Amino acid sequence: AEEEESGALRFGVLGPVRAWRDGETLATGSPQQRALLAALLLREGRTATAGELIDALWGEEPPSQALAAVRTYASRLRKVLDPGVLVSESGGYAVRGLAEGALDLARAQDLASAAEKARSAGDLCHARDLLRRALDLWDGEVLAGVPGPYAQTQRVRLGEWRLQLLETRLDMDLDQGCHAEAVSELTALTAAHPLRERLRELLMLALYRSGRQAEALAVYADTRRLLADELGVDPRPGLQELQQRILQADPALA
DNA sequence: CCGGAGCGTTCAGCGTTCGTTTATCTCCCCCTGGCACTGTCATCTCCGTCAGACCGTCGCA
Which stretches are labeled DNA-binding? Predict the structure, then answer.
């Protein structure tokens, strides 16, 4: 609320895509219109051609006379948005005139970069606040209810990036000494994510430093059984190494 | 000792919202046509290969 500048236009892509003019929300429109807006936004104001926009929205099988569909989608964007924010260059469209902090993806990138810089500088409270601000950006699943293979690719990429953000965040939480909340939320996540090995290693190191051991090795046994049932292979050697060093009761982690 | 209520799932009435087209309205690109004092023949090449042949050409005999 402290950065609510007058005349500032804010866009939301990390969840359901939305447009905010000075605090009031705009009617984005149809799901394909929303996906076109997302495709034009994530390129950081780079000119995307109409054929590439068609490929991003629809993929391999477009209808024959539906370039005018993208034309009227862009016209509806220019209706909803400013006349000058969306510019037409070389037959394509680009969302220009965006100030800093306008796009939530760029804000997340800057927050992650600042968190990494503070990790390099060793500042725990500052990077903790930066990651707290970062996690308060996306609401629910990214790109909710939009079609297209580009939308699917962005969805899975940003979900994976959020997974690594949670991994780094909670590894730092185990570094600073936050046991209870970490154990609870990682139990919830591994209930949601059954085959994510990194989060389960985080559960192992968290429970080893929290005074709880039985459910830790129970989760580990379930992990090996499910990984053998669904894949037929052996888990990563780092998980076995950390479990072995847990078994010998090494006081370095404690 | 079935009976009712609450709960789970599954479909037919109309009610709104999308997906994909269509003709009209600005802005730009691109091609053909107009210019009415008179003004009516450019242009520098090319040299210190080179080595002799092959060949047709050509005027003298």
Answer: 1-97
